[PDB]
Every structure is written in C-alpha cells, then in structure tokens.
C-alpha cells in the first residue's frame, strides 16, 4: 500500500524523530543559544501552564512540546523545495493521531478527574435547569463530537492547506508565483503549528475549567 | 446531468454567502480587542484569550458552510 | 493507510512521548533546570548578603 | 435612604455629609440619582435643588449652584 | 432527478446564508465582552457567563439553518 | 415532481435567510446587556429581565421563518 | 402544478427574508432600552412604554411578510 | 399558468425583502428616541413627535412594497 | 406569456429590495435629528429643515425603484 | 420573447437593489451634518456645502444603476 | 437568443448590486469629514484632501462593476 | 450557447456583488483616518501609512472577484 | 453542457458574494487600529501585531470562498 502504507511509514518516522531528538539533544548541549530557546519553550510553557497549570503539567507539558516538534514535520514537506505518498495519508495519519487522541483526551480528563466520574452526572440539575433533556443532551453530544470536530477540523485543515499550496506551486511553469505563495503559506504554516499548541492548551485549560 | 449541475450551483451558494458572516465577525472581535487594549493597556492578557475564543466560535459558523460546500462538491 | 498505516504513524507519536518523559524529561527537564537553579542561586545569595 | 460614604462638601463648607442611599439630582448632561451598587464615575451637574433620600428616610431638595460631584 | 437537484440547491441556500447571522452575532457579543471588561475589569466574572449564554442563543439560530440543510442533504 | 422540488427549494429559502435576523438581533441585545452592566453594575437585576424579554421577541421572528420551513418540508 | 410550485417558492421567499428586519429591529430597540436604563436608572418607567410601542411597530413589518406567506400557503 | 406562477413568485419577492428596511428603520428611530430621552429627560415632548413623523415615513417605504405585493396577488 | 411573467417578476424585484435603502435611510436621519436635539435643544429650528431635505433625498431613491416597478406593472 | 423577458427581469434587478446604497448613503451624510451642527452650531456654513457634495456623489452611484435600468427598458 | 438574454440579465446583476457598496462608502467618508471638521475646525485643509482620495478609491470599486455591466451590454 | 450564457451571467454575479465589500471597506478606513487625525492631528504621519496598507488589503478582496469575472468573460 | 454552465455560474456565486465579508472585515480592523493609535499613540507596537493577526483571519474566510471558486473553474 505505497500511497497508503508508505504514508503511515512517513508520519511514523517523523514521530520517532521527535522522540529521539528529545532525549538526545536534551542530555546535551543544549547549549546556551540552545539553552535560551529551551527556556522559551519550557518557561513560556509554564506561563501557559498557569491557566490549566498543575493537573496535566507533566502530562500536557511534555505533550504540547512534543506537539510543536511533531507538528514541524509538515513544515518539512513544505520546506522540501522551499512527490507525495508519504505526506497525504501521513497527514491524514497525523490528523488521526491528534484528533483520535483528542476524543481519547475527553476521556483522559474524565477518569483523570471528575470530570468523568462526575461527567456521567453531566445531566444533573443542569439537565434540569434547563429542565429539558434535549438541551443538555444535544449540548453534551455536541461537546464530545465538537471536541473531535474542532481538533480534527484543524488538523485536516492544516494538512489540506499543505496539499493545496503544494499544488499551486508545483503545477505552474512560472516560479515567482509559486514562491510568493509558498513564502506566505510558510508564515501561515508556522502560525498554524503554534496555533495547534495553543489549541491543545485551549482544550486543556478547558479540561481544568471544564465542568 | 441535472443533479450534477445542482451540486455545483449549491456548492457555490453555501460556500460563499454564509462565510461573509465570519469575515465580518472575526474582524468585529479584533476591532474590540484593539480598541479595548488601546483604552486600557493593562487588560491585554485578560482579553486576548477572550478574543481567540470568540474568533474560533465565529469561524466555526463558516466552517459549517464550507463543510456543506465540500459535501456537495465531493460527497 | 488504506488500512493500518495511519495506525503505525499514530503509535509512533504515543511512544515518542513516553520516550521523552522516561529519557528526555530526565535528560531534558534536569539538564535545563541548571540555569534556573543557577541564576536563582546567584541572585538569592546576592540579596541575602546585601540585606544582612 | 443613606448610602455608605457620602458627603456634600466644599473646603469652605461641607454642605451635607454621611451616607445618602438615594439622591435625586439632575446631572449637567443627564438624569442623576443615587442608589447603591453603581460603578465609580465623575460628573458635574447644573444648579438646582437636589432631593435626596438620606438616613432613616430623610429626604430633602438641596439647591445646587451646580458643580463637579 | 428534479427533486434531487432541488434538494442539493435547497441545502446550499439554507446552510450558508442564514449562518452569516451568527457569524456576525457571536462576534458582536464577544466584542461587547472585550469592551466591557476593558472599561471595567472587576466586572469580568459577572459578564463572562452572560457572554456564553448569549453566544449559545445566537449560535442556535444557524444550528436551525444547518438542521434544515442536513435534512435536505440526508433525510 | 415540480411541486415537490419547489417545496424543498422554498424550505431552504425561508429557513436560512430570515433566521440571520435573530442571529444578529439576539447578539445585539446581549451586547447591550454586557455594556450596560459593565458601565453600571448595580443595574444588573433591573436589565437582565429586559434582555430575556427582548431575546425571546427577536427569536420569535426566526421561529416564524422556521415554522414556514417545516410546513414546506412536512405539511 | 406550476402555479402550486410557485406558491410554495413564493411563501418561502416572503416569509423568511423580510422577517430578518424585525429580528434585528426588535433587538435594536431593546438594546437602546437596556443602555438608556443603565446610563440613567430613574428614566425606566418613561422609556419602557416607548420600547413596547417601538417593538410592536417593528414587529408589524414582518407580520405583513408572514401575512403574504400565509396567503400564498393557504389562500 | 406561467403568468399566474410569476404573480405568486413576484408577490413573495416584493412583499418580504423590502419590508426588512422599515423593520430595521422603525427600530433605529425608537432607539434614538430612547437614548435621547435617557440622556436628557426634559426633551421628551419635543422629540416624541419627531419619532412618530420619522416612524411613519420609514413605514411608508414598506407600505409601497406591500402595495405592489397586493397588486400582484389580487389585481 | 413569457414576457408577461418576466414583467411581474421584475416588478417584484425592483419594487421591494431597493426601497429597503430608504426605509433604513429615512430612519437614520430621524435618529440623527432626535439625538442632535436631545444633546442641544436650542439647535431644533436649524436642524429640522436639514432633516426634511435629507429625508426627501433618501426617499427619492426608492421612488425611482417604485417608478420602474410601476412601469413594469402598467407600462 | 426570451430576450424581451430577460430585459424586463434585468431592469428590475439593476434598478432596485443598487439604489438601496444611496438610500442609505444620502441618509448617512445628513445624519453626520445634523450631529455635527448640533455639537458645534458655528460650523454650519462650513459643513453644509460638504454635505451637498457628498450627497450628490452618493446619489450618482444609483443614477448609474437607474441608467442601466432605463437602457434595459427602453434602449 | 439565450446568450443575448444572459447578457441582459448579467448586465443588471453586475451593474446594480455592487454599486451599492460605494453609494454607502462615499457617504461613510463624507460623514467622517463632516464629523471631524465639526469636532476640530482647524483640521479642515488637512482632512479634505484625504476625503477626496478616499471617495475616489471607494468610487473605483463600482466603476469596476459598471465596466463589467457595459461590457455585457455593448461588447 | 448554454455554456456561453452561463459565462456571461457568472461574470455579472462575481464582478458586482463581492466588490461592494471594498466599496464599503475602503471608505470605513478613510473615515477612521479622518476621525483619528481630527481628534489628534500630531498622529497624521503615523496613521496615514496604516490607512494605505489597510485600503490595499481591502481592495485586494474585490480584485479577486474582478479576476474571476475577467476569467469568465475572456478565459 | 448543463454541468459546465453550472460550474461557471457556481464559480461566480461563490467567488464574489462571500469575499465581501473580508472586504468589510479587513477594513473594520484597520479602522480599529487607526482609532486606537489616535487615542493612545504609545500602544502602537502592542496593537499592530493584533491588527495583522486579525486581518489574516478575516482574509482566510474569502480565501475559502476563492478556493471553492477555483475548484469550480479549474478542478
């Protein structure tokens, strides 16, 4: 399944690269040019923590950092020239790990805190408040689906964006247009990844505050 | 033919006109963020997260329109 | 990614995190903490000594 | 109706003082009354008698020459 | 064919144009929240719940439009 | 066929476009509630009931549009 | 058939789009009532009757639209 | 048949969409009356007659639209 | 038949939608008159004639639309 | 027949909808004139000529629309 | 015939609806000029040239619409 | 014939209606420039470049619409 | 033929009308930037980045509309 299996292979490779690069450069050096940046990441990540802060701080902190790292993999395909069947269903694959992991995440806070021991009680006087079950139920379902809908929607929006900018650039015989698009699209991409970490933080600060 | 023609017309209708509402609404929010921060600079870290929440909720209404557009084009 | 390639790709992510925590977080968290403890330390010493 | 901390004062003379929990007075630019719980603000008001409910339901119209309250 | 073509055109019409009203309306509310908090920061926990109530009521009008759209597409 | 096609097109038209007016109007009211309470916090229990009355009257105009939509779909 | 199809399309057109004007207009008035009472609480019994008069006059314009809609559906 | 179908579609078009302008415009005026009286209560008997004049002039534009609608339905 | 059907559809289109602009515009002017007189009552005899001039110029744009409508209906 | 029907529909479309922009725009200007003169009465002879210039430029955009309408009706 | 009918309908569509944007936009600018000069009369020779630049840029958007209209009518 | 007729109708649709957004948006910006300079004349060389940037970004949205129009007319 | 005609009509519909929302929304933001900087010049480096973020988010809604337009024209 080249156009398929080759794709999952690709995204898997990126994720591994994240894993090893972590401990490897982390034992060293960083050093200082490197150290200071690591400070931006970790410390800005701490300011971000406050807000959700303590609950997932190891769990979510490690995660979001890994999310920037793994998220850069798409920038790599954009960075390539700056032909597929890695990155199409490797991008679908990332949308699946991320969005699937998000549906998983609602549960992970659910059991991790109540939250979910209390989430079964979500109906509550809230379904009585608001006395109709249609309101509370449509709301909660729209929430669980909506978390997946939002996160997956962002993921696929990103992957698709990659595919499209790629198309515009590659088909055209004239290079200049492809360049301007690709540069603008590149700023776009970086913004998108940071926006992703922010989105994880948004779902998470949700979780701390959510119910 | 008639069903295919109807899909392409329907895709144009649902994609463009509804998405105008967030094009305006995302801008309304950022104008409020800029005016609020200009009037009171110390309130920046309090209202910036509100602006992001609000922009994403406004952007979700077009993403619904775009979703129907893509269903009509490709589903 | 017709079947199963997406699966492999995602597992690489989950395990990637676990490896970070076990190894990086030991190497990363601790290796990075040196500047925190350090700047914090020299400053603290300065303040206390000046005050007393 | 007495409020919490209220006084009508000039350095020359404090006109009234203590709390007034209701005050009918015509703002220079708009309608004015007093009632607790409104937010802090500053204004001036045209001259005239200001009828204000004060403590133990004391209420009186107090002629303003107008000025910044 | 004609009935199927009419469904796809109708789905585009009801989905996109009505949803513009909340795209704008959700943004109007968040702009009021941002401007109100910038003018008076102590009123944040009082008006934030009002903003959520109000955003959800505005978002329900498009969800009605989207509901008719989905009925036309899939019912 | 032609009558059935006309019903589905008519349902899309009446459902979506008119409901934009409350999507905006419900939001206009909540923005006034938030701005009024931010300017004068003591007036909250006086104007909150006004906001509810007003939101329901604005929401009734789309519910009329939705009613015609449902008649066209199911009556 | 063609006349009946035209009735159902016409009913959708006249019902939904015109009623947006009061959905917005009823809300504009209540926002003015809330903002006016927040700025000057003593003026509440003077301007509340004005708000009711004004809401009913704005609501009459859609009721005209709805009337034409019902004539097309049932007359 | 075609002429009769055109009458019913035309009646829907002219009745609903134009009447939105007064639904909004009657409300704009009453919002100005409420805000003007809240700011300066002594000006009530001066501006109330202005509001009535102005509401009637705005309401005449839809009554023109409604007139064309009724001509198409019944003339 | 086709030409007659086109006349009745065209009459509905030109009559209703354009007349919304004065329904709004006549109201905008009267709101300015009411707010200007509330802020400064002594300026009433100066700005009332301006309001009349301005209302008539705004009302002339729909009267153009209505003129085309009547030409299509009766010419 | 088809060309003649298209002329009458096109005349309705171009005449009515575009002329809404000046119906609103002429009113926006006169509202600015009234509010500016109410705030500062001594500036009346300076800004009245500006209002006339501005009203005529806004009115020229519909007169373009009306011109196309008349070409379609009579040319 | 069908191509000629499409030209006349297309000319009406592109001429009227887009030109509403400058009818409003030219007026928005002149309202800003009038309000700015009323608030600060000494700034008149500075902002009058800005108003002319801005009016011409807004008027160019309809002139584009009118250009397409004339191409459809006469090209 | 049908494809050519569709091109000319599509050119009218995409050219005129979307270009209204900058006709309004270019004017909104120049009104902000005029009002900002009237309130604070010393800020003129700071905000004039902002106005130019902003006008060009707003004008690019119609130029997209015009581009599609020209593709439909000539491509 | 019918499918190709539907593509060209759909391209015009989705390209032009939705892009009006950013033409307005990009301008709303720059007007807020200009007014905020005029009121408080020291806040320029804080709010300029907000304006850029906000303009790009508003511009993305039309770029979605344009994307559907180009798919209809060339895909």
Author numbering:
A (entry chain K): 46 to 127, 140 to 268
B (entry chain M), E (entry chain N), F (entry chain O), G (entry chain P), H (entry chain Q), I (entry chain R), ...: 3 to 77
C (entry chain I): 2 to 53
D (entry chain H): 1 to 69
Question: Which passages does the manuscript contain on this structure?
Answer:
In most cells, the bulk of ATP, the principal source of cellular energy, is synthesized by ATP synthase. This molecular generator couples ion flow across membranes with the addition of inorganic phosphate (Pi) to ADP thereby generating ATP. Like the analogous complexes in other kingdoms, it is based on two reversible motors, termed F1 and Fo, connected by central and peripheral stalks. In vivo, subunit ε is believed to change conformation in an ATP-dependent manner to prevent rotation of the complex thereby conserving ATP when its concentration is low.
Three different conformations of the complex were identified using 3D classification in RELION. Three of the four classes containing 104,510 (State 1), 67,829 (State 2) and 53,587 (State 3) particles were movie-refined and post-processed in RELION producing maps at 7.4, 7.8, 8.5 Å, respectively. State 1 was further processed using masked classification with residual signal subtraction with a mask created by removing parts of the detergent micelle. Three out of the four classes from this classification containing 95,345 particles were combined and refined to generate the final 6.9 Å map. In all three rotational states of the E. coli F-ATPase, the εCTD had an extended conformation, albeit with a different proportion of particles observed at each state (46%, 30% and 24%), suggesting State one to be the lowest energy. All three reconstructions showed the complex in its autoinhibited state, with clear density for the εCTD extending deep into the central cavity of the F1 enzyme. To ascertain the enzymatic state of the F1 motor, we generated a difference density map between the cryo-EM density and our built model. Remarkably, clear peaks were seen at the nucleotide binding pockets, indicating that the non-catalytic binding sites in subunit α contained nucleotide, as well as the ‘closed’ αβ heterodimer. These were modeled as ATP and ADP respectively based on known orientations of these nucleotides from high-resolution crystal structures. Once a complete model was built of the highest resolution map, this was docked and refined to the other two maps to create three models.
